[PDB]
Design a protein around this motif. Structure first.
Motif, PDB file in Angstrom:
ATOM      1  N   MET A   1     157.981  16.775  58.149  1.00  0.00           N
ATOM      2  CA  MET A   1     157.098  15.563  58.196  1.00  0.00           C
ATOM      3  C   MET A   1     157.466  14.636  59.415  1.00  0.00           C
ATOM      4  O   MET A   1     158.455  13.898  59.373  1.00  0.00           O
ATOM      5  CB  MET A   1     157.223  14.762  56.870  1.00  0.00           C
ATOM      6  CG  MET A   1     156.361  13.490  56.717  1.00  0.00           C
ATOM      7  SD  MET A   1     157.484  12.084  56.575  1.00  0.00           S
ATOM      8  CE  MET A   1     158.053  12.295  54.883  1.00  0.00           C
ATOM      9  N   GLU A   2     156.706  14.714  60.528  1.00  0.00           N
ATOM     10  CA  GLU A   2     157.178  14.299  61.893  1.00  0.00           C
ATOM     11  C   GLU A   2     155.988  14.100  62.909  1.00  0.00           C
ATOM     12  O   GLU A   2     155.255  13.110  62.827  1.00  0.00           O
ATOM     13  CB  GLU A   2     158.242  15.329  62.372  1.00  0.00           C
ATOM     14  CG  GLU A   2     159.509  14.783  63.098  1.00  0.00           C
ATOM     15  CD  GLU A   2     159.921  15.462  64.394  1.00  0.00           C
ATOM     16  OE1 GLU A   2     159.019  15.667  65.230  1.00  0.00           O
ATOM     17  OE2 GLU A   2     161.107  15.800  64.589  1.00  0.00           O
ATOM     18  N   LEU A   3     155.753  15.064  63.823  1.00  0.00           N
ATOM     19  CA  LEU A   3     154.527  15.163  64.688  1.00  0.00           C
ATOM     20  C   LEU A   3     153.949  13.774  65.161  1.00  0.00           C
ATOM     21  O   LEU A   3     152.728  13.595  65.224  1.00  0.00           O
ATOM     22  CB  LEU A   3     153.435  15.973  63.918  1.00  0.00           C
ATOM     23  CG  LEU A   3     153.757  17.432  63.493  1.00  0.00           C
ATOM     24  CD1 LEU A   3     154.778  18.121  64.415  1.00  0.00           C
ATOM     25  CD2 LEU A   3     154.303  17.440  62.055  1.00  0.00           C
ATOM     26  N   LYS A   4     154.809  12.813  65.554  1.00  0.00           N
ATOM     27  CA  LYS A   4     154.469  11.673  66.474  1.00  0.00           C
ATOM     28  C   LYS A   4     153.205  11.943  67.375  1.00  0.00           C
ATOM     29  O   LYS A   4     153.335  12.392  68.522  1.00  0.00           O
ATOM     30  CB  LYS A   4     155.730  11.351  67.339  1.00  0.00           C
ATOM     31  CG  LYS A   4     156.861  10.617  66.568  1.00  0.00           C
ATOM     32  CD  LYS A   4     158.024  11.539  66.154  1.00  0.00           C
ATOM     33  CE  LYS A   4     158.000  11.820  64.639  1.00  0.00           C
ATOM     34  NZ  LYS A   4     158.676  10.700  63.923  1.00  0.00           N
TER      35      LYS A   4
END
Length: 26
Positions: free
Chosen positions: A1-4
């Protein structure tokens, strides 16, 4: 859960600040 990507436009407009720089000074 990340993807800036709500911070990836912060990134490439920061790259417009690698123009803030453009090139390692003198």
């Amino acid at each position: 859960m990340e993807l800036k990507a709500s911070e990836f436009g912060v990134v490439l407009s920061v790259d417009a600040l690698k123009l803030s720089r453009q090139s390692p000074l003198g």
